[PDB]
């Protein structure tokens, strides 16, 4: 029994869309400056639910009107997915972000919406409230960016104690902070935002060394790639972005080893076959 | 009984391709700087017709030769689509533009061509014959651009009485005029070219308050979007771009209201099912 929930946040409260409705969530996350994406197709919407959701999802009231000073400008939605058997649940969180696009793919008799959300779509933030540092180290610029965005940070890199003259006073909005942190020092150390945690680290290092995930069962075959090993798996609520993996394959014996994660492709369908996560991984140092 | 005509303009004259031949025209117009495009798949061409059409359509005689001072450099083609029953016709005009690309999609025993027409592909113009105004207001710069392009203009906006210094002295060609008029003042007021009429108006205003189109019959469902209402319809020869719509839905009761049009998705197939136009619309003010 797969259990998949799409939990919105609206003034009335959270309206959890369960797995009984036909839901299909394609989440694509990566260790880049780019906002991770979630495309979710939900069918079986009643008229009342459609009016309660789609009317709130809009790109107005911030362009031709004002109605904006803080959150509630756009609806923030999380995704909680997992398995459930014998009464125990495994519902972890796989996405948190704000909607950007609304459409319908399937016309009647199955009026099914398709909505597009990106993580940290509050880029129309308070146009940088606190000024960036004049002269500071990389770690302290990262701390300033995390404080401005409101997210807790994990800074683990060897470039922290490098002074920068003038780190990013051309930044216009809060989102461009991540692009700037990505722009400086970009052979390896790429910063990203996973859910509500801003991670700045080298690309060959793991966020949590004690949290390696031993993988033994795959879907298909764990194959080589340009950088490391690429493989698909059934949904395990313990695999994050940039986490450590301990691939132990059978079909391919040469791909065994420890890998860090760079890209993640969730494809979760409660009422359809695809319920897999695809992992891109590179050698871990 | 669908009636679709593709009318070219060549030295011999207009050679109308009727709906008896397998024709398929996919047009996509929008309120932007980009030229609205039409892909045309035409089957059943005879050898003589192919010789008459494809040999005329070319990208030469202006790069490795001269043969150019005015039109006739490339063939201009219009599209007249509609319905016909009881003897009365409904053939409107849905596209006017010049070809740029020609290829073959279907090999024998059905030699089917596929041409690609773009509106205002005569950018091979007299490299701006008349100099732009040195200092001038927005409306007068728009009038100069319309005169240079040879098209009549509809300038209806609240930014007309705003002066500019050097309004487009880097412009190289006639096409870049529209890009410039779009470039300045791009929160709302986006100028475009619909057929042979250059429209410069605010995005939340109707070019024509008296030409609202009451819509009650839809194919599928009139849905919400991140901007406005999106809906498909059977071909009505009274829906233009930037026009006003008066959506009155049944499935979705709260999408009713008055909307302006931003995009248009014509898909007309005489010998196939798709004969629909898709309308993107935003709330009108």
């Amino acid at each position: 029994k797969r259990i998949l929930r799409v939990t919105f946040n609206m003034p009335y409260g959270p309206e959890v869309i369960r797995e009984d409705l036909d839901v299909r969530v394609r989440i694509m996350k990566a260790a880049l400056r780019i906002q991770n994406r979630a495309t979710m197709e939900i069918f079986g919407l009643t008229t009342q639910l459609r009016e309660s959701l789609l009317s709130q999802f809009t790109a107005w009231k911030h362009r031709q009107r004002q109605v904006g000073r803080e959150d509630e400008l756009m609806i923030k939605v999380s995704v909680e997915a997992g398995y459930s058997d014998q009464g125990r649940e495994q519902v972890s969180r796989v996405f948190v972000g704000e909607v950007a696009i609304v459409d319908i793919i399937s016309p009647p008799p199955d009026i099914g919406i398709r909505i597009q959300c990106y993580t940290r779509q509050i880029d129309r933030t308070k146009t940088i409230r606190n000024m960036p540092p004049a002269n500071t180290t990389f770690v302290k610029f990262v701390e300033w960016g995390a404080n401005e965005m409101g997210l807790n940070f994990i800074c683990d890199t060897s470039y922290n104690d490098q002074v920068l003259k003038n780190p990013g006073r051309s930044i216009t909005v809060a989102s461009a902070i991540l692009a700037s942190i990505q722009d400086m020092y970009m052979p390896d150390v790429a910063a990203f935002v996973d859910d509500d945690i801003l991670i700045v680290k080298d690309r060959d290092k793991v966020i949590r060394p004690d949290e390696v995930t031993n993988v033994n069962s795959f879907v298909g075959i764990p194959s080589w790639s340009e950088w490391g090993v690429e493989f698909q798996c059934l949904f395990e609520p313990s695999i994050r972005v940039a986490g450590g993996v301990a691939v132990e394959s059978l079909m391919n014996p040469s791909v065994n080893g420890n890998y860090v994660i760079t890209a993640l492709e969730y494809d979760l369908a409660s009422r359809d076959r695809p319920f897999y996560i695809k992992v891109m991984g590179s050698p871990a140092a | 009984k669908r009636i679709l005509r593709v009318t070219f303009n060549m030295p011999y004259g207009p050679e109308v391709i009727r709906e008896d031949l397998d024709v398929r025209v996919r047009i996509m117009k929008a309120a932007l700087r980009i030229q609205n495009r039409a892909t045309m798949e035409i089957f059943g061409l005879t050898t003589q017709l192919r010789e008459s059409l494809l040999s005329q359509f070319t990208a030469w005689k202006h790069r490795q030769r001269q043969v150019g001072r005015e039109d006739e450099l490339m063939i201009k083609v219009s599209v007249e689509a509609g319905y016909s029953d009881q003897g009365r016709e409904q053939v409107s005009r849905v596209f006017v533009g010049e070809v740029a690309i020609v290829d073959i999609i279907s090999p024998p025993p059905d030699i089917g061509i596929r041409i690609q027409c773009y509106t205002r592909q005569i950018d091979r113009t007299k490299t701006i014959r008349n100099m732009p105004p040195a200092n001038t207001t927005f409306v007068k710069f728009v009038e100069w651009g319309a005169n240079e392009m040879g098209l009549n203009f509809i300038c209806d906006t609240s930014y007309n009485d705003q002066v500019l210094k050097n309004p487009g002295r880097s412009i190289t060609v006639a096409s870049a005029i529209l890009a410039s008029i779009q470039d300045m003042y791009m929160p709302d007021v986006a100028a475009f070219v619909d057929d042979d009429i250059l429209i410069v108006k605010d995005r939340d205003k109707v070019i024509r308050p008296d030409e609202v189109t009451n819509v009650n019959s839809f194919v599928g469902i009139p849905s919400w979007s991140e901007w406005g209402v999106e809906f498909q319809c059977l071909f009505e020869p009274s829906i233009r771009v930037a026009g006003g719509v008066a959506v009155e839905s049944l499935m979705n009761p709260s999408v009713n209201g008055n909307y302006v049009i931003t995009a248009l998705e014509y898909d007309l197939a005489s010998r196939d099912r798709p004969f629909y136009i898709k309308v993107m619309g935003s709330p009108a003010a």
């Binding site: 597009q116 461009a176 | 003042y185 929160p187």
Partner: peptide, 19 residues
Amino acid sequence: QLTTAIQDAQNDSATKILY
């Protein structure tokens, strides 16, 4: 689906129009 990638190559537009 190239449509989702098209919809993704539009997110680069902040409140700054700068203009």
